[PDB]
Design a protein around this ligand. Structure first.
Ligand SMILES: O=C(O)/C=C/c1ccc(NC(=O)C2(NC(=O)c3ccc4c(C5CCCCC5)c5n(c4c3)CC(=O)Nc3ccccc3-5)CCCC2)cc1
Ligand SMILES: CNC(=O)c1c(-c2ccc(F)cc2)oc2cc(NS(C)(=O)=O)c(OC(C)C)cc12
Length: 541
């Protein structure tokens, strides 16, 4: 069946930000027929996944618990209330949510309406290898339905993926634990080989049968009878597909693939990608596989069988993935150095701590993080990706020298150091105090994140080159600015002095002794690395 059918009505509007002007180019790419052929390997992996899902007991969330996970700036309902009303448990909001819930229990078939929109995402104007990327498309149901999804499935999508996939489930790890997991898996092989597998338009490759297969996994949980019906109804009325309405309320088309803006997008994609990849590992006869899956992003670390044998096994993996309706964008390449693998735009790199010990960390090309940080400072945004970047890429040369220096200088100048910020980190939105950054960094990356030095020449060159092309002052200017920020922070005492001491020890010759931060343990990060919620409309204060 077609991933999408279109009526002809346009997807109307809500360095460079993507707009609805490029939506037709994205519609062309994501529209195609899916061919799917299943085999014994697929069926065996599925049964194994279901036997693990059978150990899960999931709870139904109350209206209040579901309302309190709603982000403050979540899209307004068409039924006369917004995210603020949901969060305050207003009578209008709650009564509409209860009626949506009852309708899910009573109506098992009627397709639920969704809104289709072009995303406004910032990318950097690079006229070199290729041109601008068209806008990504977001498909989401009404606010009342989103609250109901949380009631039925929040506990499922938060608990089931780790129970089913174990150590392969990518969202359970902090950046420090992810690097450790990867390095240990790499070291455990006699002769390691690794590859990233990039599916072309993953969301469109997800068939109606794939979505029913996901439901079959959720249905293995011990569930309240209303949760069982709500999941059943949501699968048929929303998850498998449905009508698409534009921002002007016009009938836009019909979807028969994954909706990007539903609670199950991340969980469903991870489970589907994992099922297809684990079965393809068996078809390709890959030896001693370690997989790591984050939605459609997949990496396999295995035992090498030789140069030509590895090339042949990867061709067989791709053929199996293609039969499962997951063909690649670029064909996978075998890598024999862990640093050469790029997944989720990131790679593992090497540095040394204060003692000279070799430490590993995840990095990425800083162009998009810097362009996005520049965009957000230039235009007032409710969500700020720069803080997420400082947190997730804290050990990197670029997050420390540029991002920390620049934003702490702004916060000092504005006297806003104490002000909590809403920051979108991948999936879930969090309210974070910048003065808590040293404690957060220590917990996610370890104490070594404040003492890394002796970065790789290739990493240094990528940062320096990125600064030049974007018109950003060189690293020496950042060192000078960091020394002033550091001095101003220390002079303030308290948490500000802790920021000055730990975040900017790199900027001074006479270095301070960085001991474990006292505050660190008491920090509540219990809901940080549980599960993925990208497109799932999730908020944590
Ligand atoms: O050779 C030497 O010894 C010294 C050279 C040298 C070169 C340039 C400066 N620039 C400045 O002082 C100013 N800009 C900056 O001091 C500046 C700071 C951050 C900048 C950023 C981002 C970096 C990440 C955090 C958010 C801000 C961008 N651009 C920046 C410029 C350059 C810019 O204008 N825009 C973009 C566009 C895309 C991406 C990045 C940028 C402030 C007033 C005059 C311009 C200073 C010194
Ligand atoms: C499947 N792929 C992965 O899980 C990831 C790899 C990776 C890189 C090289 C490899 F060889 C293997 C994997 O790098 C990542 C970086 C981040 N960001 S971060 C800096 O916040 O950790 C990530 O976090 C999100 C998506 C939760 C997931 C991955």
């Amino acid at each position: 069946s077609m991933s999408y059918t279109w009526t002809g009505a346009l997807i109307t509007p809500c360095v460079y930000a993507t707009t609805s002007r490029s939506a037709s180019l994205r519609q062309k790419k994501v529209t195609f027929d899916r061919l799917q052929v299943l085999d014994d390997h697929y069926r065996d992996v599925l049964k194994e996944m279901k036997a693990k899902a059978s150990t899960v007991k999931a709870k139904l969330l109350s209206v209040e618990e579901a309302c309190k996970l709603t982000p403050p700036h979540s899209a307004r309902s068409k039924f006369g209330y917004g995210a603020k009303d949901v969060r305050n448990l207003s009578s209008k909001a709650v009564n509409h949510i209860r009626s949506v819930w009852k309708d899910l229990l009573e109506d098992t078939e009627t397709p639920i309406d969704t809104t289709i929109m072009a995303k406004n995402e910032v990318f950097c104007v690079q006229p070199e290898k290729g041109g601008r990327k068209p806008a990504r498309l977001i498909v989401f149901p009404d606010l009342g339905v989103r609250v109901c999804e949380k009631m039925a499935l929040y506990d499922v999508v938060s608990t089931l993926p780790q129970a089913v996939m174990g150590s392969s489930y990518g969202f359970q790890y902090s950046p420090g634990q992810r690097v450790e997991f990867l390095v240990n898996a790499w070291k455990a092989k006699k002769c390691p080989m690794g590859f990233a597998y990039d599916t072309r338009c993953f969301d469109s490759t997800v068939t109606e049968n794939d979505i029913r297969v996901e439901e079959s996994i959720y249905q293995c949980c011990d569930l309240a009878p209303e949760a069982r019906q709500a999941i059943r109804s949501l699968t048929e009325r929303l998850y498998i597909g449905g009508p698409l309405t534009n921002s002007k309320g016009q009938n836009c088309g019909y979807r028969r693939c994954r909706a990007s803006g539903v609670l199950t997008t991340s969980c469903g994609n991870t489970l589907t990608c994992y099922l297809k990849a684990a079965a393809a590992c068996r078809a390709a006869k890959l030896q001693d596989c370690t997989m790591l899956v984050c939605g459609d992003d997949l990496v396999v670390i295995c035992e090498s069988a030789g140069t030509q044998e590895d090339e042949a096994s990867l061709r067989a993996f791709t053929e199996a993935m293609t039969r499962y309706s997951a063909p690649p964008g670029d064909p996978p390449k075998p890598e024999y150095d862990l640093e050469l693998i790029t997944s989720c735009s990131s790679n593992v790199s090497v540095a040394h701590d204060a003692s000279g010990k070799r430490v590993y960390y995840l990095t990425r090309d800083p162009t998009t993080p810097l362009a996005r940080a520049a965009w957000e400072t230039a235009r007032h945004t409710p969500v700020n990706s720069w803080l997420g970047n400082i947190i997730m890429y804290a050990p990197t040369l670029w997050a420390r020298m540029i991002l920390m220096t620049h934003f702490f200088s702004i916060l000092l100048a504005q006297e806003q150091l104490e002000k909590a910020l809403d920051c979108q980190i991948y999936g879930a939105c969090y309210s974070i105090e910048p003065l808590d950054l040293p404690q957060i960094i220590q917990r996610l990356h370890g104490l070594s994140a404040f003492s890394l030095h002796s970065y790789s020449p290739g990493e240094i060159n990528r940062v320096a080159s990125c600064l030049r092309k974007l018109g950003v002052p060189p690293l020496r200017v950042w060192r000078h600015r960091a020394r002033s920020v550091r001095a101003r922070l220390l002079s303030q005492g308290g948490r500000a002095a802790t920021c000055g001491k730990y975040l900017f020890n790199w900027a001074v010759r006479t270095k301070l002794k960085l001991t474990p931060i006292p505050a660190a343990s008491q920090l509540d990060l219990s809901s940080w690395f549980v599960a993925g919620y990208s497109g799932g409309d999730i908020y944590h204060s």
